[PDB]
Design an enzyme around this catalytic site. Structure first.
Site, PDB file in Angstrom:
ATOM      1  N   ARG A   1       2.440  -1.844  -3.869  1.00 55.07           N
ATOM      2  CA  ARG A   1       3.790  -2.279  -3.530  1.00 55.07           C
ATOM      3  C   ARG A   1       4.721  -2.313  -4.735  1.00 55.07           C
ATOM      4  NH1 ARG A   1       3.143  -6.302   1.196  1.00 55.07           N
ATOM      5  NH2 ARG A   1       1.554  -6.872  -0.350  1.00 55.07           N
TER       6      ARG A   1
HETATM    7  N1  LIG Z   1      -3.319   5.319   2.611  1.00 55.57           N
HETATM    8  C1  LIG Z   1      -2.572   4.385   2.018  1.00 55.57           C
HETATM    9  N2  LIG Z   1      -3.094   3.718   0.965  1.00 55.57           N
HETATM   10  C2  LIG Z   1      -2.350   2.789   0.363  1.00 55.57           C
HETATM   11  N3  LIG Z   1      -1.107   2.396   0.650  1.00 55.57           N
HETATM   12  C3  LIG Z   1      -0.613   3.072   1.691  1.00 55.57           C
HETATM   13  C4  LIG Z   1      -1.261   4.059   2.417  1.00 55.57           C
HETATM   14  N4  LIG Z   1      -0.444   4.546   3.425  1.00 55.57           N
HETATM   15  C5  LIG Z   1       0.659   3.849   3.293  1.00 55.57           C
HETATM   16  N5  LIG Z   1       0.628   2.940   2.268  1.00 55.57           N
HETATM   17  C6  LIG Z   1       1.709   2.035   1.886  1.00 55.57           C
HETATM   18  O1  LIG Z   1       1.218   1.100   0.947  1.00 55.57           O
HETATM   19  C7  LIG Z   1       1.841  -0.188   1.162  1.00 55.57           C
HETATM   20  C8  LIG Z   1       0.778  -1.225   1.414  1.00 55.57           C
HETATM   21  O2  LIG Z   1       1.376  -2.318   2.140  1.00 55.57           O
HETATM   22  P1  LIG Z   1       0.675  -2.936   3.411  1.00 55.57           P
HETATM   23  O3  LIG Z   1       1.612  -3.767   4.194  1.00 55.57           O
HETATM   24  O4  LIG Z   1       0.027  -1.797   4.196  1.00 55.57           O
HETATM   25  O5  LIG Z   1      -0.501  -3.797   2.782  1.00 55.57           O
HETATM   26  P2  LIG Z   1      -1.767  -4.595   3.320  1.00 55.57           P
HETATM   27  O6  LIG Z   1      -3.034  -3.920   2.989  1.00 55.57           O
HETATM   28  O7  LIG Z   1      -1.525  -4.843   4.801  1.00 55.57           O
HETATM   29  O8  LIG Z   1      -1.622  -5.998   2.593  1.00 55.57           O
HETATM   30  P3  LIG Z   1      -1.985  -7.536   2.832  1.00 55.57           P
HETATM   31  O9  LIG Z   1      -3.345  -7.719   2.159  1.00 55.57           O
HETATM   32  O10 LIG Z   1      -0.932  -8.308   2.033  1.00 55.57           O
HETATM   33  O11 LIG Z   1      -1.988  -7.850   4.290  1.00 55.57           O
HETATM   34  C9  LIG Z   1       2.835   0.003   2.305  1.00 55.57           C
HETATM   35  O12 LIG Z   1       4.144   0.252   1.807  1.00 55.57           O
HETATM   36  C10 LIG Z   1       2.267   1.214   3.047  1.00 55.57           C
HETATM   37  O13 LIG Z   1       3.284   1.947   3.719  1.00 55.57           O
END
Ligand SMILES: Nc1ncnc2c1ncn2[C@@H]1O[C@H](COP(=O)(O)OP(=O)(O)OP(=O)(O)O)[C@@H](O)[C@H]1O
Ligand SMILES: Nc1ncnc2c1ncn2[C@@H]1O[C@H](COP(=O)(O)OP(=O)(O)OP(=O)(O)O)[C@@H](O)[C@H]1O
Ligand SMILES: Nc1ncnc2c1ncn2[C@@H]1O[C@H](COP(=O)(O)OP(=O)(O)OP(=O)(O)O)[C@@H](O)[C@H]1O
Ligand SMILES: Nc1ncnc2c1ncn2[C@@H]1O[C@H](COP(=O)(O)OP(=O)(O)OP(=O)(O)O)[C@@H](O)[C@H]1O
Ligand SMILES: Nc1ncnc2c1ncn2[C@@H]1O[C@H](COP(=O)(O)OP(=O)(O)O)[C@@H](O)[C@H]1O
Ligand SMILES: Nc1ncnc2c1ncn2[C@@H]1O[C@H](COP(=O)(O)OP(=O)(O)O)[C@@H](O)[C@H]1O
Ligand SMILES: [Mg+2]
Ligand SMILES: [Mg+2]
Ligand SMILES: [Mg+2]
Ligand SMILES: [Mg+2]
Lengths: 258, 283, 323, 323, 323, 323
Positions: free
Chosen positions: E261
């Site tokens: 992020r």
């Molecule tokens: N394959 C990918 N790997 C990593 N990041 C990605 C991927 N595809 C998209 N992203 C982007 O990376 C960011 C990660 O944010 P995200 O909301 O998905 O996190 P999270 O894993 O749900 O976090 P949390 O642990 O806080 O719930 C987003 O902006 C998302 O669009």
């Protein structure tokens, strides 16, 4: 039916304080600590009786214009109780703030403990002859109440007459300015944290003379009530080598001379 | 009928601060400090009698008990609350520390905001000896006074006698004490109009800002209240000017409680302020 | 339909306290604390049969008595029908219960309302919630019900015995509640193999067929039913000599005990024990059998208890009396 | 359709206490605690298939006994008949259930009412809620239940076995409820690859097709079902010789088990196991198999010391008897 | 009447952060933090007046896009048009709020519905913890609020800048909520004696008369909410060069931040800033102005040395970039 | 309307488990723990639009099965009709849902009933109270619900997959719930700058326009549905020979795993993988790819040792497999 006031034996600290409060309620209330068996709740209910329109007791907010109020629960009180005691001695319901405390558990707070003006302690009888007397009196009471009170009836009239006569002797003060300076000096010698002490003792010891019937106030009168109203305000430190009352006697002797 | 506000023996610290806060509603209250007794509550109730929304009767003093909640404090419904009684009056808070809530925060925020407009005073008290207030919540108060028990025999008897006198005949005493009280009322009424005429030199503003900055006092709240207090005092003295002397009398008790709490050593509270004032001034 | 009283093996000390307290209700209750097993309540719930009879005014929900105005209910005080033979009622409250049944609900009869002149049994008194346990301290030591709320007032006499049990390795009620109970007795575990075999065989035999076994014990138990009524008749004839009182008030005063709470019960317990035996005078021996049981929970001292409280009481008794 | 009983591989010790409780419905209960997995909760829920029949009156929520006029609960006592045979029931209470249904509030029948003389199964008794556990603390081992929630105060018969599971990593049971149970059996994971292969294959096979799998074991289940009924009638014929009863009691003395409850249960189970085999004369090596699993969870000991709480009981057994 | 924004003296960093957040309402807000005074809570109140206007549907309990999406939220989906062209509101939550009030109950909308596509101000975020900080962990960064309380079940769109303040000497937040914030602007009190007099004079002049003060600043302030609006139209025309984007990620990887992020935010902020200044391109300077106060908020805590914040980011940026 | 699943950049291992848990929905579940960002809650949510279809009975809220064994609820079982061929659903419960909408009470259909044969997504499972995690503990791995709270006595057929996420910097799971999850997978942040540039560009382009992105990534997604439909029918053909089933269990015996559930899953997951690559004969490299993430968390941590879980599992593989 309850014991007349002339049934309790040996223990007499509360009697002086309660009688001083009854004649003049401007002093405030009394705080007493003691065990749950020595008879704190029994002696007080006796004082409820023999209390002198045609006028001739409350236990824990309006029916308190005449008569004392007993709490029985203030010791474990945490807060708020300050409101009722402030409102009591604030005109718009004059009454005596007699209270009950215990040496352990709740000890109130120094902020509130200095709103009361009178304090006496309880000690064990430590006398086989007196204890058997108390047990015998309690047993013969339990055998049948009504004839027991009639036996002690005669002195109650004398007590009522004495109280009534002493109540109407307000102008008898004749308090000396030099002794007022001396008592202020001895009180201010130790840490008291405010002017609450001086006003209480000045209006207390004088009233004691009204109990006897004399007019002037001497050192002997003050000596018997000086400790009883200026001890629990002496919360110097937890390093209590001896009871603070002995310290009061020491300063009393070092000033006046005895 | 209550005790007049002229017979209180000594204790000029509280009276001066109370008068200043009375003649300047926007200062931000007082936090009278001290131990038990010594007439904390009598002086406040003795101030009320000595007094004469957007556009009049006698002023009223409003107080609340220690045990209270938002049922009375908010005054929710067109029911007017407890604060909706001092549109030109005063309010008193006791044992502020014992009130563990955001209600104290609400009252402070309601100050300096006439929109329901109240515009009251915010005298604070309590905390004899039970932990200082929160370092944030204590910083929204104008001045920090102090009360100490008198240590002398001559006064200690006299005050007692005085109190006894008031219980001999509660009436028939105001007329005896009438001339002194009326003098103060006329003077304060006159001084309440001379205030918008004081001029403060720009040069002294630089010096006072330097004095504030030399101390490691956080924020700017220490330079928004002193400028008002000095002007209020100068107006109270019946003049339209300000010297270095008048500021000296309203600086020690105006900024003392904003100092750093760190107990590196045993520097006295007012001693440090006096030393700085002497250092950066020709007095 | 239950275990008869005169089948318990051992555990003599508890029976003496229970019978002494049931002889005269001016006792203050009995406190039982000890390990699991050992039939803590196996005995207490067996007291339904071994009870006397009292007269009660007919159709009186409050269970009042003829005359006795000091303790006479409203329907006989201001209003003033014949009495009839009735049994003393034992009622118990469960550990999990609401506050509506204990007190009034408005007049409805509360749990304490149908408990006057009876015996109150509490089970696992150390596990009851503090909300309910603070109501019993009101009705007790006052002899009067309190509930008069909801806009309509109501008064009610209330007096019981309040005997209970519990477990010592979980907690001990409240520091102040211990003084409500006049007597306090504890039970250990009998470790003699023969007695254990005997009690196991007894329980197994009763477990076979109730009606045949219990009737077998009928001749003995009935005798007790005709032996406890004698004490209630000969009781108001015992006298105490001054030499006895001056020592019963000296032993207690020697120990650091609360004033005039231990001497009063010991003066009323031994004096009644003779009535159970059938005599009219009290000897020194009768003191020895009640002195240990009465002055145990009043003995407030340092937390260290290397010595035994009963040992201390017995040795001070021997020193004072010279026995 | 659930897993058949006579298909579980291994775990011989745990697979015997349930049968012992089924044969004699008075011993108490079996609490099983072991490591995660090991199928603690699949045997218990499969026990419903192997189950005998008892007679019970018709149209009664309490399921009272037609005979024994001393056990009539509420109204058939007053009436003192459509007697019918019935299968005993199994009722389990969820962990997330309130006290409304456990006891009863309205008189509607509570959860405890539906499990009279049957089997009550609790899952993960280690947690519960520490507040609902109190109501059943005294209802068991007493045979009577009392409800007083609102407007109704009636005595309610209640008896069951109270089987339960647990995990020894989320806490320990309160030292008061731990004594209501009858036996404690421990579980250890198997350590031989062939048995693991067998259990994996059998589970996969059952998951492949439920109904046709039963016919591969149905005769075995019928054969086991016939044996239980026979052993349920030959029980009141065995007899403990007096010397054995003295000998078993001495074992409880040395281990200092507080409370005379271990002696009663140990004796009771020894009779039942003998009836299972078919003989009618208990002997040594027949109580040897039922003592180590009954004097293990009642053995208060040093905080640490150095014993798995398993060698000491057998050492004392060998010292007393001699093997 | 509130203090005009353009009259605030100094604080050239936090004003930039707030202005950059308003122009591009998708970065993730600011987390202004510093000592007392200095008007942390003055600018936030001031910024309410200097706000743009957005279209919205009418009668809607919560604000929503009129027709831009297909409206997969609630009955507006298949019911699909009154547009009032209202102004985005400012909503704040108190520290004494309750969980039911924040979301809703039996459908009464909560605080989340009001603060959708708006500036939700949180007061002293440091103190609030545990309760009412877990529910907010899914409404942001997802755009959808799920409520499954008391039977009511709907889906709620929600996204907000979530501007929050707090003190730096009352603890630090947990990492889960720390990464939902876009930037982190630090406040330092002015110390030059020549400047504080201006602030005192301005405050005194405003307090003397709130009117006749806006007119003294109205022509100057009305020139601010014209550059911002014009900057909004130009924003969907910027084109960052591909070469720079390669180097931006290199700083992120070399500094070893946690997650991903920390790279989406920087590009959007740089584009918004370069649209604010007027040009339709991007240079190296624009990156350096906002990279300082974006990554520093996400660095790894390390007490093993005395390296401050921002210094390391500037050093790495200088080492990896040009000069 | 959501991010496409086949456009996820990197993170192959997370993609494997979420597919194996749909081909054969009999595994326990999945658990993925990792740093902030990295799209833990983005991959999971993209799975909604890529799922197969199963038949359902009429419109029953419990999602029964017409042509199946006796698992068709209880009301339907009276019959032993219309067929619809609906699509499976995924339902998620929030972080502060009340007890009403988890077990269900009024019969109001609870959340568990509505999630039958579906997937339950528990986001942020690291932060859940001691309550609401026991009522979820029994429904899994038993496949039968039991609600007895408020006057309702209903048994529900419930079965789900229990997919959960979170991060490991806020606590550790309880031992009981840690075993119900099927396989555990780990996530590590990317470090190649080019991949970060690609991922940032992808996210920005998707945000630029919600539609016209499926018009791009349509063909690469529709091939996956027919890639999983075929593999969902070839499973009941593949057989693992007896030679290797003996070996796999040995591995568990070497690792001192607790229970016999950690061995059943592998013998089923291995069969699922080979049905995904087209073969019908399990061999080595078809169980090597799955034994790492299906046995990593069912291992005693023993913080005294300093060896990571992943290395230990692979180290012992070649010990008995000769690689
Ligand atoms: N394959 C990918 N790997 C990593 N990041 C990605 C991927 N595809 C998209 N992203 C982007 O990376 C960011 C990660 O944010 P995200 O909301 O998905 O996190 P999270 O894993 O749900 O976090 P949390 O642990 O806080 O719930 C987003 O902006 C998302 O669009
Ligand atoms: N005389 C006796 N001495 C010891 N135990 C006895 C005796 N008579 C019976 N028992 C048995 O002792 C056990 C204790 O009975 P009871 O139901 O009172 O349990 P308890 O453990 O004493 O009570 P609690 O569980 O409340 O502490 C029962 O099994 C009972 O049959
Ligand atoms: N003899 C056996 N020993 C162990 N497990 C077995 C045996 N036979 C079958 N199994 C299988 O082992 C698994 C054990 O899971 P089960 O649901 O029985 O556990 P449980 O008793 O509920 O566990 P927990 O202690 O975690 O609550 C099941 O899949 C069961 O079919
Ligand atoms: N540019 C400025 N910098 C600092 N203070 C300013 C500025 N302009 C005005 N002020 C004044 O400084 C004072 C600071 O008080 P203010 O209430 O704004 O503090 P705050 O940052 O909100 O404090 P808190 O942290 O206690 O909430 C106010 O009287 C405000 O009007
Ligand atoms: N004069 C007396 N001397 C000693 N004990 C007495 C005396 N009068 C009464 N008592 C006893 O003290 C009891 C009251 O004890 P008390 O301390 O008042 O109880 P509590 O403190 O719990 O209210 C009386 O019931 C009686 O037994
Ligand atoms: N001029 C005075 N100076 C100091 N104390 C006074 C004066 N006049 C009266 N008092 C005392 O103040 C007391 C009441 O105020 P105080 O006890 O200080 O209130 P609080 O305890 O709430 O601070 C009275 O008892 C009175 O004796
Ligand atoms: Mg019992
Ligand atoms: Mg289980
Ligand atoms: Mg602010
Ligand atoms: Mg997520």
């Amino acid at each position: 039916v309850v014991f007349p006031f002339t049934a309790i034996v040996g223990q007499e600290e509360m009697k002086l304080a309660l009688l001083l409060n009854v004649i003049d309620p401007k002093i405030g209330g009394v705080m007493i600590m003691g065990d749950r068996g020595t008879g704190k709740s029994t002696t007080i209910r006796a004082l409820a009786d023999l209390l002198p329109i045609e006028f001739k007791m409350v236990d824990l907010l309006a029916k308190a214009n005449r008569g004392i109020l007993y709490v029985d629960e203030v010791n474990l009180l945490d807060d708020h109780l300050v409101d009722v005691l402030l409102d009591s001695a604030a005109s718009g319901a004059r009454f005596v703030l007699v209270g009950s405390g215990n040496p352990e558990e709740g000890e109130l707070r120094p902020q509130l403990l200095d709103r009361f003006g009178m304090h006496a302690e309880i000690h064990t009888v430590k006398e086989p002859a007196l204890r058997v007397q108390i047990v015998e009196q309690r047993s013969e009471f339990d055998q049948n109440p009504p004839t027991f009170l009639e036996k002690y009836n005669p002195e109650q009239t004398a007590l009522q007459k004495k109280i009534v006569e002493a109540q109407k002797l307000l102008p008898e003060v004749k308090l000396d300015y030099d002794l007022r300076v001396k008592i202020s000096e001895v009180c201010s010698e130790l840490d008291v944290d405010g002017l609450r002490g001086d006003i209480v003792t000045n209006r207390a010891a004088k009233a004691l003379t009204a109990y006897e019937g004399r007019t002037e106030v001497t050192v002997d009168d003050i000596r018997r009530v000086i400790t009883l109203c200026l001890r629990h305000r002496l919360r110097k430190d937890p390093l209590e080598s001896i009871d603070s009352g002995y310290k009061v006697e020491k300063v009393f002797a070092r000033i006046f001379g005895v």
